[PDB]
Structure formats: C-alpha cells, structure tokens
Structure 1
Amino acid sequence: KVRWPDFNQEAYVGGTMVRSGQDPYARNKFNQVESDKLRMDRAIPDTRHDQCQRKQWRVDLPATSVVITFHNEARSALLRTVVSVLKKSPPHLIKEIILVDDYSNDPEDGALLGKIEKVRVLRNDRREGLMRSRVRGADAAQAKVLTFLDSHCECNEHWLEPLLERVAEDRTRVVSPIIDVINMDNFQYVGASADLKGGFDWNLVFKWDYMTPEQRRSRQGNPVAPIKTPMIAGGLFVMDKFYFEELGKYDMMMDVWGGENLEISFRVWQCGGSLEIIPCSRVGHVFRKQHPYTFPGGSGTVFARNTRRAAEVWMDEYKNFYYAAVPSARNVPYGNIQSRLELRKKLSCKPFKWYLENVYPELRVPDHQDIAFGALQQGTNCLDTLGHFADGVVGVYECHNAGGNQEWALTKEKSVKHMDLCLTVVDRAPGSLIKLQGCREDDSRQKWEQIEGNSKLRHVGSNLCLDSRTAKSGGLSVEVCGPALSQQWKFTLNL
C-alpha cells in the first residue's frame, strides 16, 4: 500500500533505538547503533565474480514467495532485509514477502511493515521456533517456489535469478547463495572465501569446510558453476514448493533453532535430490557469536532434542558416532518419530552410508575397532603434530575443527595415531618430551589409555600422564600423573 521507497524508515526505526548511553549489543547481540545508522536501501559492494555479469535470464522464471521468520529482530535490520529483497529482485519474481512474526515482544515490528507493497504479515500467538514458523509461511505461500531468508540479510545484485534458474530446470535441487558477511560490529558488507562450504563433525554441529585441493582447482575451473554441498549453511535457500511439501516440509517437533539444516540436508540427499551453492547469488548475513533470544526448555536441551530427531531418523547405525561425540544426548527424550520414519519409508531413501560415500566422503569415519577418535582436546587447544614428522615433537594448538594435523585416533592396539605416526614415549623420565615415530604394533612405548572418566591420558604400565606444561619449552611431555590442569585431555569421540 506504500511503495517501499516511500516507507518512513526514520519513523519506524525511531522509537526502538538504543537509548543514549545504553548498550548497543544487548538486545540483538550485534551493534544496533550501527544497524540503525544505515539507510534501508544502503549500497553494498558487488561481490560476485566478474563472469556473473555476463548472464541473461528468461522473463518466465517462476516467481517466489519469500518467507522471513523473526523473533525480536532489530527494526532497522528487518526493514533492510525486506527492502533488499524488493530493491534487488525483479518485482515479477517476488509474488509476496511473508513475514512470520514468531511472537516478538512488540507486534508492531511486523505489523508496521505490512503496509509495504508485497509484504504480508503472519503473527504466531506463541513462540513456535524457526521450523514451525517456516512451515506456517510455506503453507501460506501462493507461489510455486519458496525462498527462505533470515531477518538480518542483505540481498545483492541479481541474487535471485540464478537460484530460480536452477530450481526451474530441476525441482529436486535445493539451492543457496554464497553467504557474504555483514560484520556484527560495524555492519560492513564483505565477502568470505568461496573455497568454504558447509559441513559438520560427528557432534552434528555445522561448520565450514575448506575445499580439498581438487575441489579448489575445479572451482577455479569454473568459478560460476554450482557447487554441490553436503550440508546447507543455514538457513538461506530456495526450494520448489511442491518438492518442499512432498519431501515432508520440516519436522514440526523441532523447536527454536538448530538441527533442521542437518535434517533437511540428509533428507534431500538421501531421498533423491541435491543441495547446491550458487556463486553468482550473493546474500549478506549478520553472523553473531551468541543467540539473542531465549530457548524455551533450555538451549542445550532443545539443540540435543532436535539433533536426536534427525539422527534417529536418518543416520542408521552412524547415529552411534553422534552419541560417541555427545554422550549426554542419550539422556534427552526426543519424542515420537514414527511420522518421520514413515516418510522415509514412503520416499524410498538411500541409507546413511550412501550419503557418506557419495555426498560427504570428506567426513572421517572411525575405524570399527577404534577406542576413541577425533581430536584430543585440552581447553580450547588440541593435540597437534605442528606439521612434524617422525622424530618430531608434538604440541598443542588452538582447535580449528579442520582435521589435518589435529586428527587422531586411539586405536584398538592402544596407540595414539595420526596417519602412520604414533605418540611415542622415547624417554620415560618424567619431564621428557614425547615424539612422533612410526607406529609399531608391539611397541610398549606407544601404548596409552584414557583414565579418570576419560579426562586424562596415561601411558600404559606407568604412572606417567601426557602433560602440556612443557609446551613453551619444546612440546608435550610425560609427567608423573597428578591433579594438574595441564594433564586434562579428552577425545571428541569415545567409542
């Protein structure tokens, strides 16, 4: 009813400003003062590859319904998301923007935006969470294609057409932009490395994976080609509405946040579709370090419950590696999953092993006889080869979750192994540095065991424990076992 350029942003953002002298970060866990300083239609740099500019699209691409859910979003960030969609998308391709107000404190945050051309607002009468909110919006959608965006995004130049083009050609493709970064402190818009894609460790927490050298070379081979990915980097994506419905929408028993990216990614791939990152599509996102809202039930309980529902439906026996990483999750009730199991059966989906082999072969799987596996953690540091080889010392280094020099297993033979190298007690005198040496089956100097509720690592047949107190002076040592912070070590997976 007002065209977006005529929407009064100053009146809208005005009453909800951070008070003079008060904390810019409190409400949103990003700097709202900096968000509020920006125009709703602020220019952002074109981060697309130059080759993206040489593309033309048919006018008959399918229109989309854009579903944005929010709970206590900053007005300036919510408005700028909406305006970026309206400004940067050919209007015929925007059937509607459905804002799902997930029981925000002030209903006017959403209601006032309903006066803008294309924008319709649905308000939940209680907190429903992003999964159920997204389903409500998708159910209300008139278009043939769904687009989901977070409520603190900024769409870039020709972001939409490349996504719609993929899905129009094959409805089983679920497609995402490259996600650019809107800095949570100063709101600068910048690009990250396009050699990163979505992934996860066995704790089922999303992380960014660095592409392999061959994947990177392929990417330089065609920097505009769609990139297959094992895991949607949540939750900015485009999906054919009928395919969304046919595949089972979202699991309605998932709450708040977390797990749903895992669940839909497993379901899409195992059940015959694909996930892509589309480099010529760029959307900025305000990444933050803490959630600004509460999780009814507890953020730890909610995340575990959602994640268990995904694991129990999709992962087959590999769910046991999740429980090895997160043993506390075995205690968290997750509710009835029969409707999802029936869905899996109806759709004739492949086993999780097929997903690992064909979609995410980069995820390292433990050996069937390993005792423990993954990273060996002390605080925020990890056991690390430091790039050393046989005869070299080992150290601690900030955990990066990228595997590599931080990949270990405690083997059936009780060795602590990286590739062909094993932690070796070359000198049993307390205070001595340990060394990497080639693994040898019956070498007593290479045998270790978890002790004290899997919180320390003792050299078998001794009273010597692994100790980082020597890290400054040259590497990790064996030391008389004692009640020392520097002797705490825990494998990420205990099998």
Structure 2
Amino acid sequence: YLTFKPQTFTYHDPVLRPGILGNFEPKEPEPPGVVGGPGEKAKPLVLGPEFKQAIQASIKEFGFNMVASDMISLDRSVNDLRQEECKYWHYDENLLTSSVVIVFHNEGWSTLMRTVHSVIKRTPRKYLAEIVLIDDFSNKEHLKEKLDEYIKLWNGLVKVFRNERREGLIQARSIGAQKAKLGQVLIYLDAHCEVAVNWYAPLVAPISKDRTICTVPLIDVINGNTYEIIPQGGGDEDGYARGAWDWSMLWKRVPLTPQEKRLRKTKTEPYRSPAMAGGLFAIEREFFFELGLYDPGLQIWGGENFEISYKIWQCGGKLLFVPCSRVGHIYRLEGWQGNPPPIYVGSSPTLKNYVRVVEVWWDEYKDYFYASRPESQALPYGDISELKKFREDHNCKSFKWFMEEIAYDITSHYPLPPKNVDWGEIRGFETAYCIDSMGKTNGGFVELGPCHRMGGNQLFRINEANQLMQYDQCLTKGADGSKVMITHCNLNEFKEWQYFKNLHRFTHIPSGKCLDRSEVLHQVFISNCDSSKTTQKWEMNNIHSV
C-alpha cells in the first residue's frame, strides 16, 4: 500500500515541427575553444612519434592519452552525432532544474575539467542548479587545492565534496544524491564525458511530464587516444539499441525493436529500454530517494545499473533512452594501471553484488543465473531484508511481468540456459591435476595444471544439453587433433559431452572417445575409452568461494 508521491508539476510533451528549428537548437554554429585546432570540432588529434614516450607514460597513469587531451581546449567544439529530426523538436522551457553530480577518483585534470566545461558551455544557465563533484578519495595532488582554487571560476556554481575513505563508485553516487540538494533532478555523469548540443531539454523533458520516468542519453564513444567522437555499434538501422543483459548479468545491447517502434509516432522520440549502462542518467531527485537509492549493500563494482533499472520498471516507473540527448564517454585504453582492491575472496565483491540484485528482483529467474554462475550459489551475499521489504511494501510487479512486458526481446538474443548437471574443477581422479583453461578463448587448447581449488580457469560446468562450459565458452574436439578446444558457444552448438559421476568418465559423444590426459606433460585430449587407464578417470568437484 506504499506509493510514490503524485505528479504535481504540469508539463507538455514536445512537438515536432519539421523544417522549423529551435527552440533549444543553438541559433548559430558553436564558437571553437581555439581557432581552429586542435581537437576541434572533434577532429582526430594524431600525434607522435616525437610524443610517443610521453603518451605511453600518461596512458600508464590514466588509461587515456593525456598529452593529446592536454592540448585540446577545455571549451572545444564537438561534432554533432544526432539525426536532423532532432533539431526540430520544440520543448516547453518549463523544465525542471538539475544538479549534475560527477564522481571522480584520480581523474586527469584536463578530462575532469572538460566534462565540467562542456556542461557549462552547452546547458541553459537557468536550468543548471549546480555541478557537484564527488571526490572519492583521490591521491593525485592536482585534484586537491589546485581544484579548489580553480573551481572559483564559476562563482560557487561548481562545488566539490571530499570522501573520508574510498566509498567506491556506487555508494559515491548515493553520497552525491545526498550532497546535491539544489536541483530537482539529478543528472549523473562520468568524469570523462563531453555533453552534446541541446542535450538537456530532450533528457529532462520526459522527467518533467512524469516524475517516475528515468532518462538516459545515448552514450557515444570518445576515442581515448585521438578524441574524435563515434556512436556505438548498436542494433538499430538508426543506431538505436536498448540495454539488456545475458543470464550471467553481463551488460549487453540489442537493437531497438519493431514493437517499440509501433508505440512511437516519430523516429527520434524517447523509447523504452530494459536497463541502463549505469554511469549517465537523470532521475527526479525525490523519486531517486523514494527508490532509494542504490542498495547500500553493493560494493565497488558492478551494477547497480541493473538494480536501479529493475526497481524503476517493477515498482511502476519508466526507463527511457532519449535519442536527442547524446553524451560522449571516453573509453579506456590498454596500458592502464589501474588496479583492484585487496579483498578476500573478496567474494568477489562484484559477484556478491549480482547475487543481491538477482535474489531481490529476479524471482524464478534466479535459476538461470545460478545455472550460468553456479559458483555463486553459496556466496555470503549479505543482508537483503530491507530490500525485500521495500519491494513488497511498494507492491512491485513480478520479474515475469517484467520479462514479458518490457524486456520481451532479450531471450531471443540471449536464450535461457539449460540447467547444470554438475559444476566445478575437473580433477584427475586421486591426483593433483586439474583441467584448466589458461584463460584461453575462441579456439585455444585447454591444458592440465596443478589444482589450486580457486575456481576461475579451473572451473567448469556441464549442461543438461551436454555442453561442457567455462564462462560463455564451450569445449569441443578440435580437428584434426584429439585436442580439446575452447570456443564461443551457441545454444545448440557442441552438445557433445556426457559425464558419468560414478564412472569417473567424461565421454565425447560424436566419437566414442573418453576424456584423457598425460600428467607430464600437462596435456588434455580424447582417446579410445579404456577402463584400465587411470588417465581417463576424472572427478568434478564444487569449488566454494567464501
């Protein structure tokens, strides 16, 4: 019998007037930061080789090409990745104000401040209540004091709040929502973003008609080396994807569906997505709290993005991607360092997070997740009570309802997994050797190695469909060898293993051959079944992580 607070704000959905510009379209072309290079207007900035050593050093420190970034104007003009039809929407002007919160940890100076500059440059002043920077316990000296003094440039409009300890990314956003009090909606941004022209009105309009709508710009790709901005490769013939997952809860994208397109009169208006990537979005501040906000249990990574997506949909709100609001996100390069925290197992902490989201929201579907990740069944996921009560109190709808009403396309791209027959290490019987992937993928060969009971590349599972899998991969027979190979798997591919626990036998089905090894050297292969050979006896043992 708990409900969200009713719409009191009146607002009119925008109107498309083909051939007429405005009202939030800039009248004239955007002034460059520097006439007329470099990095403008998002032209690629190619450097080196006189720079290559400085570039690599900065990549190690930041994951981005900071000597390139450092010569691009903080106020640089950008390419326009939106469709033409976007320019002919007329919007109320009666929009709710916003606090954009930006969480950063050790972010480079020029990438942090260009995010800030971009938002100041391309957002109507009257709607920008504040830009709140949440320092999640950085140690780099340029972010302290230097930042304090510089920030005075905006007469208090930009404020920073330090964290005493490293709260990690999810809880730092929740801290953000508490420390950002001036605006009516919270707009979250990564600290390495550039916001496109007339990004605000499209993004905040739907929230203005209906406070329980949560909004997501289309997230474009800023090349972390050369800084030109590219849309993502998404399904739609127009580039529109909706956010999705597979049944290990890995983020996936699928194309905009014809069903959703029949719901929409226009090509460019908002559209329903089952989930959001996580870093960039807008909610009405009160609604976030009614939500609220992110489950406190969630540790440093990773979403969180699904938890908030499910709450919104299943507790009566909406999640909309807004084609006419676009934001570029810089994507990391290899070479970063760039390092996890020391925890045990920790669980891992992020795995523990998936279990929290699944156990409170997925109902019967937890089965598909424990099939994809049995190693996670017996994990100490922590206290879930208040989250379960919240869902009952607000009479939230079932994950079945959610899968069939708003996420109906997912299972056509990521089909439901078969139940497991058994999972764990594949150990040679009465020995200390384990089949182990070496992390090989997509055609490599699987080896023998000393058992370490740590799961990971020594963890397998076997399907009711006769699939021997690690992660999203399967093992099959690599012709012409007798070698066992790991490749990408599809629902009816490589259904070729059957395991006889009592027999200590894995037997390849198309041949008659058994699973075999040589203990020196560390070799795994199939050969003609022979009950004498102890090299064809295996046990499959659950590896529990505490």
Question: Shorter-chain TM-score category?
Answer: 0.7 to 0.9
Distance in 2 of aligned mates of 1:28 and 1:483? 52
Distance in 2 of aligned mates of 1:109 and 1:293? 25
Classify the secondary structure of the residue corresponding to 1:458: strand
Unaligned runs of 5+ in 2: 1-32, 34-50, 234-238, 424-435, 444-460, 469-475, 484-493, 517-524, 536-546
8 Å contact from structure 2 (residues 55, 66) kept in 1: no
Distance in 1 of aligned mates of 2:111 and 2:415? 41
Distance in 1 of aligned mates of 2:221 and 2:263? 21
Which residue in the other structure is 1:292 paired with? 338
Classify the secondary structure of the residue corresponding to 1:348: coil
Classify the secondary structure of the residue corresponding to 1:174: strand
Q: Does 1:74 find its partner at 2:108?
A: yes
Which residue in the other structure is 1:202 paired with? 247
Which residue in the other structure is 1:154 paired with? 194
Residues 430 and 87 of structure 1: CA distance in aligned 2, closer, same or farther (over 3 Å): closer
Q: How many residues align?
A: 416
Q: Does 1:137 find its partner at 2:186?
A: no
- Deviation, structure 1 residue 382: 5.5
Superposed CA offset, 1:127-158 (max 9, x none): 00122211122112221111001000000000
8 Å contact from structure 1 (residues 430, 464) kept in 2: no
Superposed CA offset, 1:291-328 (max 9, x none): 83533537872211222211121112322322222233
8 Å contact from structure 2 (residues 96, 208) kept in 1: yes
Identify the match of residue 176 of structure 1 among 216, 234, 238.
216
Superposed CA offset, 1:383-428 (max 9, x none): 9xxxxxxxxxxxxxxxxxxxxxxxxx98757599xxxxxxx99xxx
Letter in 1 for 2:252: K
8 Å contact from structure 1 (residues 295, 302) kept in 2: no
Equivalent residues in 2 for 1:251-290, closer than 5 Å: 251-288=295-332
Identify the match of residue 359 of structure 1 among 374, 391, 406.
406
Classify the secondary structure of the residue corresponding to 1:25: helix
Classify the secondary structure of the residue corresponding to 1:268: helix
Classify the secondary structure of the residue corresponding to 1:286: strand
- Deviation, structure 1 residue 448: 3.8
Which residue in the other structure is 1:102 paired with? 136
Q: Does 1:85 find its partner at 2:115?
A: no
- Deviation, structure 1 residue 231: 1.0
Residues 367 and 43 of structure 1: CA distance in aligned 2, closer, same or farther (over 3 Å): closer
8 Å contact from structure 1 (residues 232, 261) kept in 2: yes
- Deviation, structure 1 residue 211: 4.2
Equivalent residues in 2 for 1:184-333, closer than 5 Å: 184-193=224-233, 194-212=239-257, 214=258, 222-288=266-332, 292-295=338-341, 297=343, 301-333=348-380
Greater shift after overlay, 345-354 or 63-72?
Answer: 345-354
Classify the secondary structure of the residue corresponding to 1:340: helix
Superposed CA offset, 1:4-55 (max 9, x none): x9xxxxxxxxxxx999576121122122222212110111101111011112
Q: Does 1:125 find its partner at 2:164?
A: yes
Equivalent residues in 2 for 1:303-452, closer than 5 Å: 303-361=350-408, 362-363=410-411, 364=414, 366=416, 381=441, 448-450=497-499
8 Å contact from structure 1 (residues 153, 286) kept in 2: yes
Letter in 2 for 1:40: L
Residues 39 and 57 of structure 1: CA distance in aligned 2, closer, same or farther (over 3 Å): same
- Deviation, structure 1 residue 430: 7.9
- Deviation, structure 1 residue 122: 0.7
Distance in 2 of aligned mates of 1:252 and 1:143? 23
Letter in 2 for 1:449: Q
Letter in 1 for 2:106: N
Letter in 2 for 1:254: L
Distance in 2 of aligned mates of 1:257 and 1:303? 5
Distance in 1 of aligned mates of 2:497 and 2:166? 49
- Deviation, structure 1 residue 112: 3.7
Letter in 1 for 2:164: D
- Deviation, structure 1 residue 59: 2.4
Greater shift after overlay, 193-202 or 217-226?
Answer: 217-226
Letter in 1 for 2:271: I
Which residue in the other structure is 1:29 paired with? 63
8 Å contact from structure 1 (residues 199, 207) kept in 2: yes
Superposed CA offset, 1:67-126 (max 9, x none): 111111111110000011110010111000000000111333642453132101111011
Classify the secondary structure of the residue corresponding to 2:298: coil
Letter in 1 for 2:174: V
Residues 121 and 452 of structure 1: CA distance in aligned 2, closer, same or farther (over 3 Å): farther
- Deviation, structure 1 residue 215: 5.8
Distance in 1 of aligned mates of 2:119 and 2:404? 38
Residues 110 and 219 of structure 1: CA distance in aligned 2, closer, same or farther (over 3 Å): farther
Q: Does 1:46 find its partner at 2:80?
A: yes
Please, what is the CA RMSD of the aligned residues?
Answer: 4.3
Distance in 2 of aligned mates of 1:355 and 1:205? 18
- Deviation, structure 1 residue 287: 2.0
Letter in 2 for 1:294: P
Distance in 2 of aligned mates of 1:109 and 1:197? 40
Letter in 1 for 2:96: P
Which residue in the other structure is 1:462 paired with? 512
Residues 310 and 216 of structure 1: CA distance in aligned 2, closer, same or farther (over 3 Å): closer
Q: How does the TM-score come out when normalised to structure 2?
A: 0.66
- Deviation, structure 1 residue 254: 1.4
8 Å contact from structure 2 (residues 244, 274) kept in 1: yes
8 Å contact from structure 1 (residues 176, 277) kept in 2: yes
Classify the secondary structure of the residue corresponding to 1:162: helix
Classify the secondary structure of the residue corresponding to 1:344: helix
- Deviation, structure 1 residue 281: 0.4
Distance in 1 of aligned mates of 2:221 and 2:246? 23
- Deviation, structure 1 residue 478: 8.3
8 Å contact from structure 1 (residues 183, 286) kept in 2: yes
Letter in 2 for 1:235: G
Distance in 2 of aligned mates of 1:150 and 1:245? 21
Distance in 1 of aligned mates of 2:298 and 2:495? 45
Letter in 1 for 2:278: G
Distance in 1 of aligned mates of 2:534 and 2:281? 50
Letter in 2 for 1:459: H
Greater shift after overlay, 194-203 or 120-129?
Answer: 194-203
Classify the secondary structure of the residue corresponding to 1:319: helix
**Percent sequence identity over aligned pairs:** 34
8 Å contact from structure 1 (residues 195, 216) kept in 2: no
Greater shift after overlay, 255-264 or 355-364?
Answer: 355-364
Superposed CA offset, 1:367-394 (max 9, x none): 7767599xxx9866569xxxxxxxxxxx
Q: How does the TM-score come out when normalised to structure 1?
A: 0.73
Distance in 1 of aligned mates of 2:350 and 2:77? 36
Residues 57 and 71 of structure 1: CA distance in aligned 2, closer, same or farther (over 3 Å): same
